[PDB]
């Protein structure tokens, strides 16, 4: 494309001992004023894994289908539940398509965040694409990734994109702990949201904190 | 009739179509298949024969009961190589119709799509066609299922049972006695079994999956504890 | 491997699909046309298999242009498709040059289109002799492309079935100086006693040229009053 | 030839255009090479029997780089070809590493070029050979791990010999090698045991004007073709004259 | 056909379609060149009607350069194309290596020629061979030979057309290392043992030295011509 | 019923079904040198025995390598495997650059199997006579093999065209390859494989029976001319 | 399938050439087309092989036809294949004055045609060109000039040829009658002799055989006949010789 | 060597019998299908019972899904007789033609132009060697831009022809005499005027036209006709509750 119109929010994506955490606003803004407050960016990928937009919303939605086709076509051939594509594997493959468009002209403005689950010891090998208790993670299954539009790749233990990489995540580098519970990890990302509301233009209510627990992937809608 | 049988562009004086009846008699001497409706959901088997000599080979390994997304199944009848080209076009044929439209292909369109694929070989005088039959069913929520075969050279129709392979006038004996359309999924699955001892041993080489159980309403596995007990004697 | 000339040389010398070409339109329906002194004559009689057919409907003399009339004779497949590049090539020519496609312009060029036919790898020669006509600047012209490539001008011929002794009837019934309306008379008896048939009417396609007038198609009631003697 | 095309397998599981094509390699001049611990000799034979020839012009020992040198045999025009292909693919090896070919990954490329019916990829597509090349090359040199010595045929099979010999009489000098071929043999050992394998099969005489072998050393690693000095004092030797 | 190896093997191991090729040659007009110390004479032989075909449009003796003599035998109408395809590449090497091209070069590019047709697909095997006499990258002088086969040789001395065993035996014997300019000749026009005709009006003379290739004028031919028959009694 | 008229190209197909142009070429794997795989509970070897034209000449490799778990041995003509070895070396390389993890294995053999596939409908091109057996290493142990035509068996045992009637039999009665836990008695087991299914009045293995094992921990490991001759190729 | 090719560039074991050597025959079946130069021009005859009497016979011929303003062949062969080589001498004779701002020497126009009929039978797998032309013209380096081309290419060098049927009657005519130098006038009752002598008659029909002419007038008029003008040429043909 | 069965060769009597080849496919399949015209109105039956070709076990398969019926336009249907395989083909071949016209000429195509596109790409098929001939007939049915009904008939080789009411399938040779008979009883009848009784006047003509080739009772539930007619004007296929009370029109 040439030029981010229609702009988003960014995301917060950290992770504890049940699972990763990425939350967001469901708020677009085109140009200087929010057209559209009703709008999800954390698009589920996978039974495992998730992905978060930021920047451009429009040419979001064509990774999201280049990446939702491949989710059909890597359940084709799941003869086992091991040959399913690990998160690793999507950030690999999100990371090579930035890339090839950073050789040419249009680059598609996103700062992609892929999340999820690498590991397969937890059984779910049957998997519905339309429609008890959580698991303990070893905090080296759960990854983390971040891609900028220039095509930069790499993974941590909290991911935090476009604004909130200089609000939130300097809250977060000294208060973030290892292996926290559910409710500190929520706590911690509805304080740092709120002080993006705060010092934002972009920004507003409406989050959708998603979960990627070991049972699979749920939705929520708060109002902090 | 002398001479106009060897390639697939020539017509034979009689108005039949040499090259293609051939094909019919390679896939009556393959492995069957088998896909018949049920008033729950739909239900597939591929019994395998050629697998009797090898018994090296995995007990769940020859599968033959491929599909193009979460709720569409596609099998074959006789060459497995042909029709794999042709399941990579129906995959591709799902993908594309995903790209253009964010919407699962309907049936009644896909089967349009590939039956194409296969006749555009018919009409080429430098290629080879396919050998291969291909039995395509799903089963809708609101509406019932339909199972769709697309045999050599197009034709594509709809069914309600049907099986192709080195028996399909055996086993289609069987179907017709009682009326499937209205029984169960669950007591289908011994049911099957009860022609394939008749018309061959006590081995676990059939494999074969079902696309709706009020299962969430998509393409499930064998489910081998479901497949234990096998009524060997009734 | 898929384009090798089918339409190869014999040891007698000769294109011997190129005669089982033209025994195809010596086996068909017959074409007359006839050029005079202030216009030319095309006629074709329309063998009528059956009564259901529209007679609006089928066609053996097209329009190439406002003033180029084409008749065939053969296989009618092949027709529509040099009917195509017969118009498509009389475009080409009033796009460049502001004025309207001189005859031997055009027959150069439908020549050069149905000659290809016959050295081009995988396919066969056309199965059809046209019979292109018009008003021209230079006068009236009448050209026959056969089936090898080459054209010929002629004067007054036909090309259908039975072309040598009905081709006789104009090497005693024409002049060197013949009216238009003379011409009608002489076409229409070509083609009603020369063959058995059947008392010919309303299966009779004529096209004129009416003295530099637009190429005018007969009609069924039009060519009654000339059919009447 | 008779309706069959290039592509074709018989009953017994083999190609017709390939089988046809390996009774060509039987009628070239005779060759042998032989590829001791110590280093790699070739040798052939030089028909001139036209005295109208420059006798410069032919030679039935080229060479594709300073490490590997091969011979010909067969139809000696298509050897130009593969020969100019395999100068070509291992001087640009040259440009991409900088160190010098290996023998087996220069056989390699050039038997994927007597093969290039059924291949699907690109460095040949600009001119797919449509027949096999009928000739079989005896290629040798001292890459590394040591001097090395194959030899290569039109069905692709290249098998690594220790001591070869092709041309016409390929089958009258093969027992001569498998009988007096050692294990432990030094260069003269080997130039004279190449000699003498090209002189019970041989209808003429072993003077200077009939016999152009060369050799490639392992310390320099650079081949060198034998001129009048070095055959005429060799072939002197006869450490074996029986008749 | 199109793309269709038409150069096949045959059931015993050579190749069909240019062993015809190689027999065209036999049916065309005879040719021979000797190589001397630093000139080069040719001799091609033609056959035309007489009173008609006056300047002959120089079917044989055909230069490549100004230093690149080139004689051929068999299909006169395929040296329209491998000449052109030749004096092509003269140029071309002139143009990227701002040499003038050796004959050592240029009989690798007609032999290279050559062997692409009776390799590539679709395509007829060149039914013609020639011999190109030029000057190598120093002042050497060598003759070459290139057989529709591919393969090509330098030579001393060949002769090359009809029945080319009969005219190249009798230069295997009476032919000199260094043969003066006016006895070179003799020799060349001594191969009128082919051609049964001993007018000349059939055999065609050049020389080539000093990087300029001279004919032979009419004058001087007959009076060589003059010598041949009281020779033979 | 013919084998004049329905033989001379890919297309045409016999009155029975069968297409004799690729079955052709299925015979050729029947032609060349013998291959076993046993595939244990947590290893995989393949044995392979090469052939000598010549006494002078060298016994040229069998087995080959394609990436740092996957490894096959050809049957059949070597110069078609030469084009599917390197394809499936391509392939693998391609997946550790576009991605960072191992290649698939069932994924590989579906992408050589498909090459097969294309080699087969048109008339221009000819089927690769040539058997591959893959044996790989992913997640769990596997054995793959491929035909003229398009096909995928995951198979325990196998043999190549040579002796594969006196081979199949030794492993169709041997089912404790799986509870074989130990390596030397699976490479063993292999090994007798080839020396049961070896022509009369032949060496039984003089260094010249290539022998490679992979599994959970062991790469695409090569056995030297150290190893097997001295234990393993010397217990009978 | 490949069982339909009929390998028409294929060698045979004699050496020559198959489908040239059929066409070579066929155009001997044709028309006959006389070549002629003399010292004023150049002068090509015809014979217009007769099909009905309602062809015009006045305004046009297929036999002679006109390459530029000074270069004219006259066809002797198979009349469909001709024309695609008509169209391809016009376009070289025109591409050289587009390239060069000169006229084409008729030298080098027949080396561009022979080269298209050449590359036929080398390769792409067709049927040769079936024909083969007197083509003759007038330039500037050299004067008139007359060459005749073949269906395999091998073109050469004439003053007087006459191609076509019954060649070997024909040539006999002008081997002994054609004189080293001669007029129009006398040129024009030559190749009107040895026409009359080829199709064993005694005087033409005047509804018969068409010639032209170029002799270059510094400005190459090439003037072709009519039918009132071939009378004045038959007169003086049934005068005297 | 004589080959008369390559695609492209003319037989030494002027002939393609390749074409005469595949014109008998289509009869031996013997699907007769009706196509008659009428008052601003035409109408096309089927016979919708199977295609005799290789073996069809019945009593399983679905009727109502199994039809030689296909819409090209929302104007402009057509039936398709032959080869099942073809028969799909010349249809998607149709429908990409239709679709072709409307992006590239504004309206809605022609019944008669997209019939002569239809028998222009079927011509490539016989003049060239590379493909196969579609044994594939049909029944181009619409109505035109000047409120005409338009009736056009394609055969497997070039044939554009049109008719104002014909017969395809395997009984072309004798349904002509039986059409034209049955045709005479509409133009020389009483004839009072129009009253938009097409429905009447030509669907209860056009069944009664298939009722002579077919001595069957013509069962409603294998039996499907379609109607263009005007102030509809969408390829309107009569329904099964329509079908049998036509049928009992005899008395």
């Known amino acids: ?224 | ?234 | ?229 | 030839e008779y309706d069959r095309g290039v592509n074709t397998f018989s009953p017994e599981g083999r190609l017709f255009q390939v089988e046809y094509a390996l009774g060509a390699i039987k009628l070239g001049s005779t060759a042998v090479g032989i590829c001791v611990n110590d280093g790699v000799i070739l040798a052939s034979e030089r028909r001139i029997s036209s005295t109208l020839i420059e006798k410069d012009s032919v030679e039935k020992l080229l060479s594709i780089d300073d490490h590997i040198g091969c011979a010909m045999s067969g139809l000696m025009a298509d050897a130009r070809t593969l020969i100019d292909y395999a100068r070509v693919e291992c001087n640009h090896y040259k440009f991409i590493y900088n160190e010098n070919i290996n023998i087996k990954s220069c056989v390699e490329l050039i038997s994927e070029l007597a093969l290039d019916f059924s291949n699907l990829s690109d460095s040949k597509r600009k001119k797919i050979m449509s027949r096999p090349f009928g000739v079989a090359l005896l290629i040798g040199g001292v890459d590394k791990n040591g001097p090395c010595l194959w030899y290569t045929e039109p069905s692709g099979t290249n098998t690594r010999f220790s001591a070869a010999s092709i041309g016409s009489a390929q089958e009258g000098a093969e027992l001569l090698l498998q009988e007096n071929y050692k294990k432990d043999m030094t260069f003269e050992q080997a130039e004279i045991l190449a000699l003498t394998v090209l002189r019970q099969v041989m209808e003429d005489k072993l003077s200077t004007s009939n016999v152009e072998i060369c050799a490639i050393k392992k310390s320099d690693q650079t081949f060198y073709k034998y001129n009048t000095d070095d055959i005429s004092r060799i072939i002197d030797v006869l450490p074996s004259p029986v008749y | ?233 | ?236 | ?241 | ?251």
């Open chain 6, 1 to 236: 019923m013919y084998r004049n008229l329905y033989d001379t190209d890919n297309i045409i197909y016999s009155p029975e079904g069968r297409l004799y142009q690729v079955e052709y070429a299925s015979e050729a794997i029947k032609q060349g040198t013998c291959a076993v795989a046993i595939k244990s509970k947590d290893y995989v070897v393949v044995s392979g025995l090469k052939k000598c034209i010549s006494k002078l000449s060298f016994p040229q490799e069998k087995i080959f390598k394609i990436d740092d778990y996957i490894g096959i041995s050809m049957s059949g003509i070597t110069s078609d495997a030469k084009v599917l070895t390197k394809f499936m070396q391509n392939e693998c390389l391609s997946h550790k650059f576009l991605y960072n993890e191992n290649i698939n294995i069932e994924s590989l053999v579906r992408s050589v199997a498909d090459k097969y596939q294309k080699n087969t409908q048109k008339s221009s091109k000819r089927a690769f006579g040539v058997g591959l057996m893959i044996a790989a290493y992913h997640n769990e142990p596997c054995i793959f093999e491929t035909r003229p035509n398009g096909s995928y068996f995951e198979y325990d045992a196998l043999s190549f065209g040579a002796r594969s009637h006196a081979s199949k039999t030794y492993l169709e009665k041997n089912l404790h390859l799986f509870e074989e836990c130990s390596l030397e008695e699976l490479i063993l087991h292999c090994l007798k494989a080839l020396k049961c299914s070896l022509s009369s009045e032949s060496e039984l293995t003089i260094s010249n029976t290539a022998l490679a094992v992979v599994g959970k921990n062991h790469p695409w490991q090569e056995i030297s001319s150290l190893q097997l001759e001295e234990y393993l190729s010397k217990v009978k």
């Open chain 1, 1 to 224: 494309t040439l030029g981010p119109v229609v702009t988003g929010t960014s995301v917060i994506a950290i992770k504890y001992k049940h699972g990763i955490m990425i939350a967001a606003d469901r708020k677009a803004s085109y140009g200087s004023y929010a057209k559209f407050q009703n709008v999800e960016r954390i698009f589920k990928i996978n039974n495992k894994t998730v992905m978060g937009f930021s920047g451009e919303l429009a040419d979001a939605q064509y990774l999201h289908e280049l990446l939702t086709r491949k989710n059909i076509n890597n359940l084709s051939e799941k003869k086992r539940k091991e040959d399913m594509y690990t998160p690793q594997h999507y950030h690999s493959y999100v990371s090579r398509v930035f890339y090839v468009r950073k050789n040419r002209i249009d680059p598609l403005f996103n700062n992609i965040i892929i999340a999820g689950i690498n590991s397969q010891k937890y059984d779910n090998n049957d998997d519905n694409v339309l429609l008890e208790e959580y698991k303990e993670i070893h905090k080296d299954d759960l990854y983390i990734g971040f891609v900028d539009m220039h095509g930069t790749n790499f993974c941590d233990d909290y991911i935090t994109t476009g604004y909130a990489r200089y609000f939130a995540l300097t809250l977060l580098r000294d208060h973030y702990k290892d292996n926290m519970t559910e409710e500190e990890a929520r706590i911690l990302i509805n304080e740092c949201l709120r002080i993006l509301y705060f010092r934002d233009a972009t920004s507003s209510n409406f989050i959708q904190i998603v979960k990627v627990t070991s049972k699979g992937v749920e939705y929520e809608e708060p109002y902090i």
């Open chain 8, 1 to 251: 060597s004589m080959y008369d069965r390559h695609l492209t060769i003319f037989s030494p009597d002027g002939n393609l019998y390749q074409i005469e080849y595949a014109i008998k496919a289509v009869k031996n399949t013997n699907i007769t299908s009706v196509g008659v015209k009428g008052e601003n109105c035409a109408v096309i039956i089927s016979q919708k019972k199977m295609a005799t070709q290789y073996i069809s076990q019945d009593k399983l398969l679905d009727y109502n899904n199994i039809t030689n019926i296909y819409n090209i336009t929302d104007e402009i249907g057509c039936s398709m007789v032959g080869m099942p395989g073809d028969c799909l083909s010349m249809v998607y071949k149709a429908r990409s033609e239709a679709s072709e016209f409307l992006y590239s000429n504004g309206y809605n195509v022609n019944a008669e132009t997209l019939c002569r596109n239809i028998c222009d790409k079927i011509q490539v098929y016989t003049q060239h060697a590379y493909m196969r001939l579609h044994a594939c007939s049909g029944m181009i049915i619409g109505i035109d831009e000047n409120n005409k009904p338009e009736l056009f008939k394609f055969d497997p080789s070039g044939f554009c022809a049109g008719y104002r009411a014909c017969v395809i399938g395997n009984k072309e040779q004798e349904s002509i005499s039986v059409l034209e008979r049955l045709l005479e009883k509409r133009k020389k009848k009483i004839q009072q005027e129009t009253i938009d009784e097409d429905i009447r006047n030509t669907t209860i003509l056009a069944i009664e036209a298939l009722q002579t080739i077919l001595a069957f009772d013509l069962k409603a539930s294998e039996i499907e006709v379609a109607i263009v007619s005007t102030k509809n004007r969408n390829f309107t296929q009569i329904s099964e509750k329509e079908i049998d009370n036509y049928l009992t029109y005899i008395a």
């Open chain 7, 1 to 241: 399938a490949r069982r339909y090719d009929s390998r028409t560039t294929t060698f045979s074991p004699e050496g020559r050439l198959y489908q040239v050597e059929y066409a070579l025959e066929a155009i001997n079946n044709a028309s006959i087309t006389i070549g002629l130069i003399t010292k004023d021009g150049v002068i090509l005859g015809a014979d217009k092989v007769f099909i009905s009497k309602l062809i015009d016979k006045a305004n046009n011929y297929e036999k002679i036809y006109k390459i530029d303003k000074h270069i004219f062949c006259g066809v002797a062969g198979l009349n469909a294949d001709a024309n695609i080589l008509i169209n391809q001498s016009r376009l070289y004779a025109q591409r050289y004055l587009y390239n060069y701002n000169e006229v084409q020497p008729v030298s080098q126009l027949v080396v561009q045609i022979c080269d298209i009929k050449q590359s036929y039978t080398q390769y792409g797998g067709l049927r040769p060109y079936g024909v083969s032309f007197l083509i003759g013209g007038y330039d500037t380096k050299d004067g008139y000039q007359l060459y005749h081309t073949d269906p395999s290419g091998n073109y050469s060098g004439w003053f007087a040829t006459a191609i076509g049927t019954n060649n070997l009657t024909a040539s006999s005519v002008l081997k002994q009658e054609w004189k080293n130098d001669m007029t129009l006038e006398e040129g024009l009752l030559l190749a009107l002799k040895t026409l009359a002598k080829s199709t064993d008659t005694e005087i033409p029909k005047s509804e018969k055989i068409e010639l032209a002419y170029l002799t270059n007038k510094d400005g190459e008029v090439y003037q072709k006949y009519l039918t009132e003008k071939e009378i004045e040429e038959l007169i003086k043909l049934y005068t005297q010789k």
């Open chain 3, 1 to 229: 491997e898929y384009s090798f000339s089918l339409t190869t040389f014999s040891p007698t010398g000769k294109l011997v699909q190129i005669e089982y070409a033209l025994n195809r339109v010596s086996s068909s329906s017959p074409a007359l046309g006839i050029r005079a002194k202030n216009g030319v004559i095309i006629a074709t009689e329309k063998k009528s298999p059956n009564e259901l057919i529209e007679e609006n409907s089928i066609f053996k003399i097209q329009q190439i242009s406002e003033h180029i009339g084409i008749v065939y004779a053969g296989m009618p497949g092949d027709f529509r498709v040099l009917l195509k590049r017969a118009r498509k090539e009389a475009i080409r020519y009033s796009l460049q040059y502001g004025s309207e496609i001189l005859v031997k312009e055009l027959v150069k060029i439908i020549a050069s289109i149905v000659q290809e036919f016959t050295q081009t790898g995988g396919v066969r020669p056309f199965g059809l002799s046209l019979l292109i006509c018009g008003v021209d600047v230079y006068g009236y012209h009448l050209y026959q492309i056969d089936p090898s490539g080459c054209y010929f001008n002629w004067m007054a011929t036909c090309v259908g079935k039975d072309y040598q002794n009905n081709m006789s009837f104009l090497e005693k019934r024409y002049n060197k100086d013949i009216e238009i309306e003379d011409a009608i008379h002489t076409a229409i008896l070509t083609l009603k006693e020369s063959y058995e048939g059947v008392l010919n009417e309303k299966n009779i396609e004529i096209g004129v040229a009416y003295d530099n007038k637009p190429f005018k198609i007969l009609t069924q009631n039009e060519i009654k009053d000339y059919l009447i003697e």
């Open chain 2, 1 to 234: 009739s002398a001479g106009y049988d060897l390639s697939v562009s020539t017509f034979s004086p009689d108005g039949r179509l040499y090259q293609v009846e051939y094909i019919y008699k390679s896939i009556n001497n393959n492995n069957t298949a088998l896909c018949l409706e049920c008033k729950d959901g739909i239900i597939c088997c591929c019994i395998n024969s050629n697998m009797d000599k090898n018994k090296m080979i995995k007990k769940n390994s020859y599968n033959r009961i491929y599909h193009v997304n979460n709720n569409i199944i596609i099998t074959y009848s006789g060459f497995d190589g042909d029709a794999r080209n042709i399941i990579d076009r129906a995959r591709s044929e799902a993908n594309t119709y995903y790209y253009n439209f964010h919407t699962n292909i309907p049936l009644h369109i896909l089967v349009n799509r590939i039956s194409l694929y296969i006749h555009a070989y018919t009409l080429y005088w430098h290629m080879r066609p396919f050998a291969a039959s291909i039995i395509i069913s799903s089963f809708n929520e609101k509406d019932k299922g339909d199972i769709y075969c697309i045999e050599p050279n197009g034709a594509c129709y709809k069914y309600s049972g049907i099986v192709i392979g080195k028996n399909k006038e055996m086993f289609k004996t069987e179907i017709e006695k009682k009326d499937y359309k209205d029984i169960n999924v669950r007591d289908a699955i011994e049911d099957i079994y009860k022609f394939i001892l008749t018309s061959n041993n006590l081995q676990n080489l059939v494999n074969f999956s079902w696309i709706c159980k009020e299962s969430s309403y998509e393409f499930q596995n064998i489910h081998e504890e479901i497949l234990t007990p096998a009524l060997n004697k009734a």
């Open chain 5, 1 to 233: 056909s199109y793309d269709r190896a038409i150069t096949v093997f045959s059931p015993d191991g050579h190749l069909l379609q240019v062993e015809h090729a190689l027999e065209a040659v036999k049916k065309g007009g005879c040719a021979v060149a000797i190589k001397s110390s630093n000139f080069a004479v040719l001799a091609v032989e033609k056959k035309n009607i007489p009173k008609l075909q006056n300047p002959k449009t120089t079917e044989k003796l055909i230069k490549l350069d100004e230093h690149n003599c080139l004689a051929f035998a068999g299909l006169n109408a395929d040296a329209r194309v491998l000449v052109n395809k030749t004096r092509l590449e003269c140029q071309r090497y002139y143009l990227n290596m701002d040499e003038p091209a050796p004959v050592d070069y240029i009989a690798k590019y007609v032999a290279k020629v050559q062997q692409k047709f009776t390799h590539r697909g679709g395509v007829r095997p060149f039914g013609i061979a020639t011999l190109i006499a030029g000057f190598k990258n120093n002042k050497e002088i060598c003759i070459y030979q290139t057989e529709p086969s591919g393969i090509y040789a330098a030579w001393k001395a060949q002769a090359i057309g009809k029945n080319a065993k009969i005219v190249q035996e009798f230069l295997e014997k009476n032919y000199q290392e260094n043969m003066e300019q006016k006895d070179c000749i003799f020799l060349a026009l001594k191969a009128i043992f082919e051609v049964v005709e001993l007018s000349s009006k059939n055999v065609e003379v050049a020389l080539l030295t000093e990087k300029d290739l001279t004919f032979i004028e009419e004058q001087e031919i007959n009076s060589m011509v003059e010598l041949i028959d009281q020779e033979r009694t």
